[PDB]
From Swiss-Prot, chains A, B, C, D:
It catalyses: (S)-mandelate = (R)-mandelate. It is an enzyme of class 5 (isomerase). Pfam families: MR_MLE_C, MR_MLE_N. Changing residue 315 to Q: Reduces activity 10000-fold. SUPFAM superfamilies: Enolase C-terminal domain-like, Enolase N-terminal domain-like. SMART domains: MR_MLE. InterPro entries: Enolase-like_C_sf (IPR036849), Enolase-like_N (IPR029017), Enolase_C-like (IPR029065), Mandel_Rmase/mucon_lact_enz_CS (IPR018110), Mandelate_racemase (IPR015654), Mandelate_racemase_C (IPR013342), Mandelate_racemase_N_dom (IPR013341), RHMD-like (IPR046945). Belongs to the mandelate racemase/muconate lactonizing enzyme family. The lineage of its organism: Bacteria, Pseudomonadati, Pseudomonadota, Gammaproteobacteria, Pseudomonadales. This is Mandelate racemase.
Length: 357, 357, 357, 357
């Protein structure tokens, strides 16, 4: 009855404002693939994918363009679609860029389903919209810019900032954290992200020094696939180890939680498998007793976290603000879901033309 | 915007046809509580609860009548409602009859949400309706009636029957299974249910004899809360141990699966927490690699299993056929979801009057 | 030879004095079901059940009234009665309100057995009556009322108080504890109860701050059914984690202790299964090396703790003082068992009439 | 001193002869990406990647074309190159198609290093060339074609064949295996591959029936990422469970072996990380005591297995025979490494032109 009738993708390289420097490299612009899922009901689902590096952008668009043939004329039923894609990519490997593509189709299919029923996604999932506390995510900015960006986020009403660390010396990490604390006061949350840059001994040593400074969480201290190593670092800390942005699918989350790799989780709506994967991830975080935050995709994540039993923090990192209307607002540090069908993503069409690849 | 405006319950004691004798007692009629959830949108959600024994029926209705005050004027948002009920019954114990009541409200709220959007529940959950293979569930019937009921189920197109066993001697168990096999042939599925009647040594001994007869599964061989004991019986068998009808909430399922108590699961839509609990249970069964069947509530279960990644068997045991229209059909041994908004439960109002308590 | 000849129940809503505010809600009056178990020997056993919320009160009374038929004309033999009730509610679920009802019948049957033999319950169990140290249980009272109630309990001879915490900020929790310590001095016991209000990361952080203040124990820091999560919080603490008021039956206690969820236990005489369940719980606490305190039901608990090898503290929280004679006295902070047959509960019959529901 | 000076890729869709039907779909032609790595020494390294489905072919070529910029002008040092690529794709996810691309560059860099030193790859790795027993890999061919292909492989001197199974009924699986056994005699090896098509209960049941037929190994009975489920199936079998073709990198192999998912391993030279990943995988298989076979890429695998301490079987499945010279020969069922520098891959340039995409 409602059928998918086409898939259109556009690759853009959009401006950010502050380039995201991390201890393992910098993301200077955002390579995005914008997705339009057309249906027989005359509504169009919208989603976007983040490619991380320009190197992977045209490959990801091509992959989505070659996948269009297997979903056109299929019923608009995201759970059934995801099972069929998992089976088609059985031999190839349903992970990495293929899983990320399948997740972009899922998020557009759920946006289209919300539009068919004229209801915001959070209400289609069975939950009430509620404000979700958000932290402002900044990068490896050095002492002066990290303190300036934190004072600005506090002025805009945010009650927490995430900074990236992993400087050559531990003293530089601490200098950044101390200067932020001094500027914003003892009540503000300061999350820190090591971006997989330390080995386990180094991560135990640096994390115990940061713990004595009072940070909110320590994110991906070592290689993301090393769940055992994260369990070893967590076992030496009172402060929670945070991870999850790199789990590809709920099945990778299940492995990390099964061995106790972290006390907090922050799945990425794209890498976890879209809305379909997020619902599954949410059920696992509830049983393992893990507070669950989001990673990027703040527009759909404000919806997904209101339906998440252990919802913790929303991450504000506006990757797509240049090409979409600002329907998601932040009031007093909380994200407020727009009262629009589906996810509430509306393209600024003449801005897209400027950034097209 | 859509609000719950009232809750009405009616207690009935309805005729079955074949009384359900089990190795621990007989269920001779069905004590049901019929639930009507009224909304500000002019649609009415419908569900029913099964009380198991007449002894618990008026208590369950009273409990639902006294809970009406906390849900009237709340938004029709089942996930948000369930979180609020879990918190209200925090101290009292969110399990047993209270959890069963909360699950009846959930199943009616999701039926009402399907009606507001004029869509079958399975499509609101994001899946396509598909036929689900079903087995016909019979009871501790002795050799002659168990063989007669199995020949009739095969004539109606079912490809599997469940019989109850746990007779004084193992020889009687085997006599029942052999006589069914002889009547229906080697291709037919014969599930057997011990209904918690054996201790662990006895269950290992009897199950290894039944395994040599070729049964499909062995269900609740010992006390249902003894997950460790079920793991000990399963470790001695090739045939799968089946359980799950008695898990109250996904959190009890999570404990049993975490220690490997069974190779199959069959949650009960009421005891697991309604549609909201079933979605969570489905995500856990997928990660633990457990084929998931249903227990009773065949009308909503045909919908829930089409959205369940490891869906296995639907149980046909028509408890409420006397008071609801036969919109769920079985064609060639498969259940076919009706093309009706919500769950498709329509009361036969003048039959209800005959069975009212 | 002695037979149960009738069961009578009365639902009352009795005044407390200080309403019990907790971090998850308030209990402003006590919904109780008073039970009279009549026997062929002309003695009447007495017990009461606590319903926690008015919402569950008439349901619990109805349940007990409908169960009367299965115990009338049965021998007054509590262990045999409990096995028969466990088997009857096999399919329904022998937990929650059904288990709580079965436990009220058990406690009345043991009171009646003490009366038939004209001996206090503790001596029928094979033990000597001894004074049991008791703590006074208060609630989420804020700094000024929590300090006032603690000074009064010290003036009445108690050497320990329990306060409830879980305020929006950790600073408020600590303010309450510090102000009590200042008022009562460093020798007094200050137990704190979080009433399941924190998630695991939050509970580790707050408990390590309270541990540096010197509290006696930290009670139910997170969701009561999450034994694994309590083991994770306990593993980070020197101070003991306390729990057990919500275990329904010794079999739930056995699961929590098997994974090391707590260093202290406090079973509830009703939820644990009455006197029959308490004897079983006591044997488990002795082998796992767990000091065992009680939760509510101070009249029967003074008897049960004198027969408990690891007896630790009795909880004073007088729920039923309005409708029963004060035969249990507290002298110098210890409860003194009355020298009366059975449990020593004597109804104040004209006060009951005032609170009847 | 030797520098990489360019990277050229060509996408082809080459003929197979027998289409590879599996229980989860068919591979009817082979989508390959041919890679030419040019160096400052005037030698050109050659490798190819297998894309599994036409859907992923142009995406994989594009990805390799966009990666060329990060390796041109880098020293021809495969171990150093792999560490630098792992770090560059840190955030994006060093798995799936990105890992497969990085592995194609690795295999071409090692072919080029063998050419610079004018020595076969196996001798550059420090080992002697030796004949490696090989099995002929066939597909889901039905009874008559599976028996015909097995008689032909025995006539060509192979002593073992792999057939694919996972037919609707277990009886069909057994019919295929029995008919092959009858044709080739009891001394011949018959490997069977389920291609992830069964759930765990079904896989235990079918594998124990095949074990009584005498097969050499049972390959990927269930979902490849479910290591725990493979450990559960292996624990019920005497026959070895085989897996490994889908491990992306030695770190996924390490997780599967750490929990005992299989008694045999067969890494894929592309998915495992090329020659660099294979050397690491070989060291892990030796310590865990796992006989190690190969998956596809028979040209480089004959070299890699002669340097593998637990080398077991080489898989013959000639994907690229149409576009490369037959320098790898099979004599009496064993693969014989050519006496050529590097890997011995020489393009048939005018055949490539026919299959170019
Ligand atoms: Mn991060
Ligand atoms: Mn059953
Ligand atoms: Mn408490
Ligand atoms: Mn294979």
């Amino acid at each position: 009855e409602v059928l998918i009738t086409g898939l259109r993708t556009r690759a853009v390289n959009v401006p950010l404002a502050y380039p995201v420097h991390t201890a393992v490299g910098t993301v200077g612009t955002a390579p995005l693939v914008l997705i339009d899922l057309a249906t027989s009901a005359g509504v169009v689902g919208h989603s976007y994918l983040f490619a991380y590096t320009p190197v992977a952008l045209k490959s990801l668009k091509q992959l989505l363009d070659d996948m269009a043939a297997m979903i056109v004329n299929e019923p608009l039923a995201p759970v059934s679609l995801e099972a069929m894609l998992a089976k088609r990519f059985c031999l190839a490997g349903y992970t990495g860029l293929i899983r990320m593509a399948a997740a972009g189709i899922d998020m557009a299919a759920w946006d289209a389903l919300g539009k068919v029923h004229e209801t915001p996604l959070v209400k289609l999932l069975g939950a009430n919209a509620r404000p979700v506390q958000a932290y402002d995510s900044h990068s490896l900015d050095g002492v002066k810019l990290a303190t300036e960006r934190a004072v600005t986020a506090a002025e805009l009403g945010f009650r927490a900032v995430k900074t990236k660390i992993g400087y050559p010396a531990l003293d530089q990490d601490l200098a950044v954290v101390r200067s932020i604390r001094q500027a914003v006061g003892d009540d503000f949350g300061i999350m820190v992200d090591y971006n997989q840059s330390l080995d386990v001994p180094a991560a135990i040593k640096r994390s115990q020094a940061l713990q004595q400074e009072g940070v909110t969480w320590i994110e991906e201290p070592t290689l993301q696939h090393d769940y055992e190593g994260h369990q070893r670092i967590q076992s030496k800390l009172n402060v929670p180890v945070q991870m999850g942005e790199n789990w590809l699918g709920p099945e990778e989350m299940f492995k990390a939680l099964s061995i106790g790799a972290c006390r907090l989780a922050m799945p990425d709506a794209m890498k976890i498998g879209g809305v379909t994967g997020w619902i599954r991830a949410s059920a696992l975080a509830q049983q393992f007793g893990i507070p669950m935050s989001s990673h990027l995709f703040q527009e759909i994540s404000a919806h997904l976290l209101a339906a998440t039993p252990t919802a913790h923090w929303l991450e504000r990192l506006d990757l797509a603000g240049s090409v979409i209307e600002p329907t998601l607002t932040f009031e007093g540090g909380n994200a407020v879901i727009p009262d629009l069908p589906g996810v509430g993503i509306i393209w600024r069409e003449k801005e897209i033309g400027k950034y097209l690849v």
